[PDB]
Design a protein around this ligand. Structure first.
Ligand SMILES: N=C(N)NOCC[C@H](N)C(=O)O
Length: 96
């Protein structure tokens, strides 16, 4: 629920959460922060799994955050999120 998140200076809600996410779709990943207008890091293809450490809610989505090989932080949207209602869309993959 929202009660477990903190909020940063851009209004992004965030918390620590460690799990694995396997994509069921091609999902574009971002650099710099959880905004689709940010530079594109690349994509998860269906069946690819990443291990994340932080969850955020910003720019209409729930995102998870992980570190790439070079140490770049990569922001992956995993479902839609409506800020005013906290309503979540279906997950774009599997969490385990
Ligand atoms: N939403 C802000 N400003 N900070 O996040 C923490 C708020 C805390 N869970 C509370 O409910 O008071």
């Amino acid at each position: 629920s929202n009660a477990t998140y903190k909020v940063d200076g851009k209004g992004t809600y965030y918390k620590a959460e460690s799990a694995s996410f396997t994509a069921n779709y091609d999902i574009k990943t971002r650099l710099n922060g959880p905004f689709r207008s940010n530079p594109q890091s690349g994509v998860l293809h269906p069946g690819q799994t990443i291990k994340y450490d932080t969850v955020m809610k910003q720019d209409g989505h729930v995102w998870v955050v992980y570190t790439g090989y070079s140490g770049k932080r990569i922001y992956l949207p995993v479902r839609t999120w409506d800020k005013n209602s906290n309503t979540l869309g279906p997950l774009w993959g599997i969490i385990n």
